[PDB]
């Protein structure tokens, strides 16, 4: 029997429901979202990472022209300076000034730690959404199952065959262009491999930055060669990758309003509280009555031993009764201040059933219904 239900991603209230079928007493359905992984397919646009600076000795031709020769490195920058140093070696270096020309070169390179201390620019194409949907029937709970949203991987557990249709909200901080550093994800724009970025991520660009011969925009501006030292001086606008990494004042991982632990590589948002999960659930016929609703439940009193104020399943209560015939009978409480975890009781002329319940209230007064007859239970949460 197929029963299609939608469970709120709330572990405060696990969403309790009854499965009706004609000539039968209902089936225990308690649904808990144990874990959510929102996983999208990621197409890498570029790497940006910690560079290591290389300062070579600059090619100076005394009394002759020197033009920059490109030497390919991630932020290779040169500038050609004439009048490099004062005349003679009494003011330091070279007879000429006018004819003397220095190419003042410096660059940044890759570290081989640009594959383990780097952020990653991702274009994002359509994903899958997992919801670990635990559906409880009788005292047995575990049928906790992930299913890919694309209809390619349905849970075919017999007593709760779950197909998980698209979650109503699936926490994706994995938008069209997203940079992920570590766990910390930042929505950040980038082109495919277009214009550079200075003072933000895209400091190094290229599909891998663990190699040399890249395109950078760290905005290195060589200054006139300092006289009395062999050096290549520069001013710069701030190093953008490091600056972007330090713009962690609210990464989406850390402000995830579902408590999602964003984790990196295809990218996923782990253990969210996001959305409500469509579930098409194949209810087992074994968890209804024999062929007829024929149990009668009579002479009932309900005692609550304990409850904790507004809990996951902190309610423990027992309903004493006398029951006739045999079926599998619902021990749920439809009420909103408490709903019962146990939504089945194996009717076989049972006279005591201890049920576990969940609440969202500081007092457990729920009307619990057995197969036929219902009572109200009371205690304190």
């Amino acid at each position: 029997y197929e029963h299609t239900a939608v469970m709120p991603n709330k572990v405060g209230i696990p969403y309790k429901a009854l499965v009706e079928r004609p000539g039968y007493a209902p089936v225990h359905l308690q649904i808990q979202l144990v874990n959510t992984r929102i996983i999208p397919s990621t197409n890498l646009e570029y790497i940006t990472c910690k560079y290591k600076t290389k300062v070579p000795s600059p090619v100076v031709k005394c009394c002759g022209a020197t033009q920059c020769t490109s030497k390919p490195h991630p932020d290779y920058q040169c500038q050609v300076f004439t009048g490099v140093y004062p005349f003679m070696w009494g003011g330091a270096y070279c007879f000429c000034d006018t004819e003397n020309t220095q190419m003042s070169e410096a660059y940044v390179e890759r570290s081989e730690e640009c594959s383990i201390d780097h952020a990653k620019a991702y274009k994002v194409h359509t994903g899958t959404v997992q919801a670990m949907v635990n559906i409880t029937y009788g005292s047995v709970s575990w049928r906790s199952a992930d299913v890919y949203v694309n209809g390619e991987t349905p849970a075919k557990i017999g007593d709760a065959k779950l197909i998980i249709g698209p979650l109503s909200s699936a926490w994706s901080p994995f938008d069209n262009k997203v940079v992920v550093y570590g766990h910390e994800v930042y929505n950040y724009d980038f082109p495919e491999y277009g214009t550079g970025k200075a003072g933000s991520f895209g400091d190094l660009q290229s599909r891998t930055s663990t190699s040399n011969d890249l395109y950078a925009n760290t905005n290195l501006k060589l200054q006139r060669p300092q006289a009395g030292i062999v050096h290549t001086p520069f001013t710069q606008a701030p190093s953008g990758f490091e600056r972007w990494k330090r713009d962690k004042g609210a990464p989406l991982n850390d402000v995830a309003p579902f408590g999602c632990s964003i984790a990196l590589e295809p990218l996923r948002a782990e253990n969210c509280a996001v959305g409500s999960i469509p579930i098409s659930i194949d209810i087992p016929d074994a968890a209804f009555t024999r062929i007829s609703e024929t149990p009668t439940v009579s002479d009932l009193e309900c005692k609550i031993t304990e409850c904790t104020y507004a809990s996951d399943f902190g309610g423990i209560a027992t309903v004493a009764y006398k029951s006739s015939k045999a079926g599998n009978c619902p021990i749920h409480s439809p009420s909103g201040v408490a709903v019962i975890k146990e939504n089945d009781v194996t009717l076989a002329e049972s006279g005591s059933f201890t049920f576990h319940f969940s609440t969202a209230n500081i007092h457990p007064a729920f009307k619990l219904q057995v197969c036929t007859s219902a009572v109200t239970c009371k205690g304190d949460c």
């Binding site: 709330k10 405060g12 209230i13 081989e112 383990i116 910390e184 850390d254 579902f258 996951d312």
Partner: protein
Amino acid sequence: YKLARPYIADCPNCGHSRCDSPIAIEEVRGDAHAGVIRIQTSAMFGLKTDGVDLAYMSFMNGKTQKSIKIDNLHVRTSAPCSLVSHHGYYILAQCPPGDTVTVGFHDGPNRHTCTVAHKVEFRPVGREKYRHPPEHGVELPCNRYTHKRADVPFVPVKAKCIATLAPEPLVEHKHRTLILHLHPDHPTLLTTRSLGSDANPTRQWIERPTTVNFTVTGEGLEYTWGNHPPKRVWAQES
């Protein structure tokens, strides 16, 4: 190579009036989330005449190729450095500030020291700082290098790096409200967000006994404290 002997290299700047030195640093790795730096350079530690050792070095002094036991011959970055492992062509040291890398001989008549500029940073992989792992506190992911000679080459890898722990985080549960009496002895980044459909989107670095009350919608909250493994509740008892 590892067994290949040191040699003169361009770097015409030393702190004395002799500057005909080795050292130019072929490659350096130090963009780790550890505190340690692996250097590939001529003026090789981990090589004597016996080949690869863990506590001897060899160097060109400016013109004298020889080996010694490590005495007054010091590696430094922007601070002194005590080596951890020597691997032939590779030096491995604990060097806390990083950045510049300085290999130098503080010998008598010829006192050469070369420094090469590089961007060697030690940073969070999460949100907890690393710059010199001690031996006290929680182990967390980092980049590091192998610390014993394989004579294979020392190259980047990821290992485990210690980062400081903080005192007991006294949680107090109340209804739809979770006050967190937190008692850092050291800078902890406190990030919170709810594990409900509400949120507590609050990053702050905290030090010293304080309280911070947070909302709970009936689905608890996650708080990561110090970037130590999260303390998370999912109850409406929270």
